């Protein structure tokens, strides 16, 4: 089931289009700084990303319309090492029909959504999901 495309700037004004990431598996995570799960889970993700990045899985944590500073702070606080983008006026969110928050979409290399993950993730789970979508 096809994944709605989008273009947002990450947190250094750098333009990211979802369809550019064809070939790679995409851990598409929707989040806000208020969500207590993302405080638990971002360190897990940064940790698994050390492993999975060069296996061809990519993470795109789409923050849900918060200001640039709020995000940068949260990123620093939780040692983020992975691409975060800003959905400033919340359109991508609506495009994706999201809530709960967080919500993760697992997108395979062809670009279809293989699993919608909602609620809580163990690092253990995060790892499995990253397997579920990696190219090899």
From Swiss-Prot:
What cellular component terms from Gene Ontology apply here?
plasma membrane
Would the keyword Transmembrane helix be found if you checked this record's keyword annotation?
Answer: yes
A GO biological process of this protein is: cytochrome complex assembly
Q: Where in the cell is it found?
A: Cell membrane
Q: In which pathway does it act?
A: Protein modification; cytochrome c assembly
| Protein family according to the UniProt entry | Belongs to the thioredoxin family. ResA subfamily.
Which pairs of Cys residues are joined through disulfide bonds in the record?
Answer: 35-38
GO molecular function terms attached to this record: antioxidant activity; disulfide oxidoreductase activity
Q: Give residue ranges for domain Thioredoxin.
A: 1-135
Role this protein plays: Thiol-disulfide oxidoreductase which is required in disulfide reduction during c-type cytochrome synthesis. May accept reducing equivalents from CcdA, leading to breakage of disulfide bonds in apocytochrome c; following this reduction heme can be covalently attached. Does not play a role in sporulation.
Q: Which UniProt keywords apply?
A: Cell membrane, Cytochrome c-type biogenesis, Disulfide bond, Membrane, Oxidoreductase, Redox-active center, Signal-anchor, Transmembrane, Transmembrane helix
Regarding the membrane, this protein is recorded as: Single-pass type II membrane protein
Q: What is this protein called?
A: Thiol-disulfide oxidoreductase ResA
Predominant location: membrane
């Amino acid at each position: 089931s096809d994944a709605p495309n989008f273009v947002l700037e990450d947190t250094n004004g750098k333009r990211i289009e979802l369809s550019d990431l064809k070939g790679k598996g995409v851990f598409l995570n929707f989040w806000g700084t208020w969500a207590e799960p993302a405080k638990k889970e971002f360190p897990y993700m940064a940790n698994q990303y050390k492993h999975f990045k060069s296996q061809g899985v990519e993470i795109v944590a789409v923050n849900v319309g918060e200001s640039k500073i709020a995000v940068h702070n949260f990123m620093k606080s939780y040692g983020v090492n992975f691409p975060v983008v800003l959905d400033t006026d919340r359109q991508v969110l609506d495009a994706y029909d999201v809530s709960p928050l967080p919500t993760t979409f697992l997108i395979n290399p062809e670009g279809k959504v293989v699993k919608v993950v909602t609620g809580t993730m163990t690092e253990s789970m995060i790892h499995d999901y990253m397997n579920l979508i990696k190219p090899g």
